Amino acid sequence: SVRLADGKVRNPEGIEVNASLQCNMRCQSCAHLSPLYRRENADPAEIHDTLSVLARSYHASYAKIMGGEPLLHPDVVGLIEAVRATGISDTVLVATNGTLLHRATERFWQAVDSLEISVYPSRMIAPEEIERYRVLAREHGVSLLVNYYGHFRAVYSESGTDAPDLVRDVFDTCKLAHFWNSHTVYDGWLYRCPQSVFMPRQLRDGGWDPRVDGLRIEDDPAFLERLHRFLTADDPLRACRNCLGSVGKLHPHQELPRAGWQVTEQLAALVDYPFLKVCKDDITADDGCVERSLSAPVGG
Ligand SMILES: C[S@@+](CC[C@H](N)C(=O)[O-])C[C@H]1O[C@@H](n2cnc3c(N)ncnc32)[C@H](O)[C@@H]1O
Ligand SMILES: CN[C@@H]1[C@H](O)[C@H](NC)[C@@H](O)[C@@H](O[C@@H]2O[C@H](C)C[C@H](O)C2=O)[C@H]1O
Ligand code: SF4
Numbered sequence: 209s210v211r212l213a214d215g216k217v218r219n220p221e222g223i224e225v226n227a228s229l230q231c232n233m234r235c236q237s238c239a240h241l242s243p244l245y246r247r248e249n250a251d252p253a254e255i256h257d258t259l260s261v262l263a264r265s266y267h268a269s270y271a272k273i274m275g276g277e278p279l280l281h282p283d284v285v286g287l288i289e290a291v292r293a294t295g296i297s298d299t300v301l302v303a304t305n306g307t308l309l310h311r312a313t314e315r316f317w318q319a320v321d322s323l324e325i326s327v328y329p330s331r332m333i334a335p336e337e338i339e340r341y342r343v344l345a346r347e348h349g350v351s352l353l354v355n356y357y358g359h360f361r362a363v364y365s366e367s368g369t370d371a372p373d374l375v376r377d378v379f380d381t382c383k384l385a386h387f388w389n390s391h392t393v394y395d396g397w398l399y400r401c402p403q404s405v406f407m408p409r410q411l412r413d414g415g416w417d418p419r420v421d422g423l424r425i426e427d428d429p430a431f432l433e434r435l436h437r438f439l440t441a442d443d444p445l446r447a448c449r450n451c452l453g454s455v456g457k458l459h460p461h462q463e464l465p466r467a468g469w470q471v472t473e474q475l476a477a478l479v480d481y482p483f484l485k486v487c488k489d490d491i492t493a494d495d496g497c498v499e500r501s502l503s504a505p506v507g508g
């Protein structure tokens with residue numbers, strides 16, 4: 209999966225760059241807890257500097273420009289170009305809820321390699337508009353993927369678990385840690401997953417410093433094997449104790465517009481235990497969240 213080659217850690221999936229921590233939706237069980245985050249747009253110069261350092265010892269297939277909703281970013285193309293210019297990835301992908309996609313310029317389509325549109329019931333996108341986006345993508349040689357979500361799985365609780373057996377099983381079947389390789393860059397540090405950096409400070413008792421679970425991005429000679437150890441380590445993070453990994457219980461997707469988004473239910477009551485047993489046998493088991501999907505790939 210994640211392997212060394214030509215003096216770099218290779219991620220066959222993506223390095224995740226959260227353009228905006230905030231969002232324009234309030235999805236229940238949002239894995240980045242974006243409904244709880246204030247306006248915070250990444251600085252392209254800062255992102256370029258950090259990723260240029262990491263790029264000397266790390267390379268991923270794509271850089272996933274995301275966040276909450278990256279189309280909220282005032283200069284998403286400047287961020288794309290900064291990420292591309294680091295050489296940290298072969299391609300640059302933007303993942304978006306689509307609601308703001310009408311605002312995107314031609315300048316945006318010219319700078320993007322791939323586009324992923326999550327389509328949720330509460331913010332449904334008209335097939336005529338998705339058709340137009342398919343035409344636009346083909347026009348600019350952009351790969352397009354449109355996911356129609358039926359469900360989400362719970363992701364965390366402020367009321368974490370004390371049983372190491374549960375934490376271990378949650379971490380062991382976590383697709384973010386082991387399969388999707390949701391490597392996340394934030395404020396100069398690298399994380400195994402978005403939950404480990406964005407959840408702890410949202411635990412209303414204050415949580416803890418997320419840097420306990422991350423790795424400071426540096427480029428001394430000793431960094432390469434440090435990165436190698438960090439990204440293949442097989443022990444649960446501290447954030448796993450409050451996390452449901454990929455085995456939280458399934459619920460019909462919906463927004464929670466009213467205040468009180470935080471989850472306080474006992475973690476163990478939120479675990480999908482039959483699905484955990486399934487993911488123990490096969491960590492790639494479909495999570496049941498996408499009901500229909502459409503892809504218009506551009507063949508390399
Ligand atoms: C955190 S979102 C951010 C990017 C963009 N705003 C979006 O939603 O597509 C990244 C991906 O994770 C998915 N996701 C977030 N929370 C999830 C959950 N609790 N269960 C299943 N998928 C989830 C979203 O559908 C999306 O494809
Ligand atoms: C079936 N749905 C999946 C699927 O499309 C994956 N395909 C490789 C993709 O990896 C998606 O994104 C991840 O979602 C996590 C919950 C948060 C993380 O930040 C992230 O990127 C998405 O959730
Ligand atoms: S659209 Fe939903 S899943 Fe995506 S960042 Fe916003 S609240 Fe989270």
Ligand code: SF4
Binds near residue numbers: 401453
């Ligand atoms: S905190 Fe742990 S269980 Fe949660 S997403 Fe990260 S590695 Fe997976």
